[PDB]
Design a protein around this ligand. Structure first.
Ligand SMILES: [Mn+2]
Ligand SMILES: [Mn+2]
Length: 363
């Protein structure tokens, strides 16, 4: 199958500020032969929603066409429908929820007609996870197995529930749509029960758009904002989540934020830590920080410098036939070094270790 001989560690970053928000993001192809993730990051929405922002991560599969179309138009499909609009003053929570549901269903059908029309040869599909942030609500949006979480008061206040085929209701639908869930896959093939695209799984005659083997229907949750307590939001594809849990990642990002305010760097650190933890998938993260996101701490920066220096000395002593990096990491791990980044652990310190190793054993 895919898998490069070596991972494409090139980071594609972006950052911005506006509407009281700050953000950074990182996308990296990793070990996969192709890059099928995509994203949207926008502060200030058109048509009278300049106070609104929108961020989303798309994990494409069997191609990037659906993911890419989604990242450039899922938003307008959401905001530009009669349900979201619901012509009145500002959109009510229901307008926003209905607007999003319709946006998903409409862009799905819309891509389907384009494909049928132009004899599209791809059979790709994509997940979508994001947040629609208004001046008073963050509406989490989920469709698939990508995941998002809101850290509030140093804790995981909310996180999206991944749509897996064996989930009771998904399984129910799948079976009623004539399919079966074999272990964790729709008919032994698809590992997600919801996604846009995957039109071959949406041909069950006698079933609605949301009653097919794979559903384009999103789960939306309205969370009232808290200026005082809202810290940050993390949106990432399963390439991240496969190897780091909710509180681990949350704890990890906090530790990195106490050390830097460069949100692109924090995202790169999450991606490399997950690659070092063994993720062999495309990886994408969007970190959106609120006014009360943790701040850089002088003592935290000190402890980091101390740890980096300490790790460099260990390598010097360990490297001494001169063991390969794989083995130096092995030694370091058996030493059970204290004060390693929470959640990220030694893997989050691999670039420091490897940089020293490289200076000492350049050939
Ligand atoms: Mn993919
Ligand atoms: Mn993935």
């Amino acid at each position: 199958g895919a898998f490069l001989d070596k991972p494409k560690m090139e980071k594609h970053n972006a950052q911005g500020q506006g509407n009281g928000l700050r953000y950074g993001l990182s996308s990296m192809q990793g070990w996969r032969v192709e890059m099928e993730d995509a994203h949207t990051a926008v502060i200030g929405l058109p048509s009278g929603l300049e106070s609104w922002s929108f961020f989303a991560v798309y994990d494409g599969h069997a191609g990037s066409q659906v993911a890419k179309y989604c990242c450039e138009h899922l938003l307008d499909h959401i905001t530009n429908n009669q349900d979201f609009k619901g012509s009145a003053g500002a959109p009510s929570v229901e307008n926003v929820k209905n607007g999003i549901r319709t946006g998903f269903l409409e862009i799905d059908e819309h891509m389907r007609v384009m494909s049928e029309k132009k004899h599209g040869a791809d059979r790709s599909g994509s997940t979508a996870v994001g947040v629609l942030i208004s001046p008073q609500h963050t509406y989490f949006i989920n469709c698939g197995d990508s995941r998002g979480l809101l850290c509030r008061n140093r804790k995981v206040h909310f996180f999206t529930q991944d749509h897996k085929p064996s989930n009771p209701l998904e399984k129910e639908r799948i079976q009623n749509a004539g399919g079966s869930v074999m272990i964790q896959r729709v008919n032994g093939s698809l590992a997600v029960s919801r996604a846009l695209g995957d039109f071959d799984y949406k041909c069950v005659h006698g079933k609605g758009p949301t009653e097919q083997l794979v559903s384009p229907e999103p789960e939306v949750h309205d969370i009232e904002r808290s200026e005082e307590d809202d810290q940050f939001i993390i949106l990432a594809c399963d390439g991240i989540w496969d190897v780091m849990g909710n509180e681990e990642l949350c704890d990890f990002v906090r530790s990195r934020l106490e050390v830097t305010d460069d949100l692109e760097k924090v995202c790169n650190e999450v991606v490399d830590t997950c690659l070092y933890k063994g993720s062999r998938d495309n990886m994408s993260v969007i970190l959106i920080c609120f006014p009360n996101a943790p701040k850089v701490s002088p003592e935290a920066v000190k402890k980091e410098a101390e740890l980096d220096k300490y790790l460099e000395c260990r390598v010097e002593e360990i490297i001494k036939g001169v063991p390969d990096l794989v083995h130096v990491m092995r030694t370091l791990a058996s030493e059970n070094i204290p004060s390693l980044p929470p959640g990220g652990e030694l893997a989050s310190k691999r670039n420091v270790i490897e940089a020293v190793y490289n200076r000492l054993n350049p050939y």
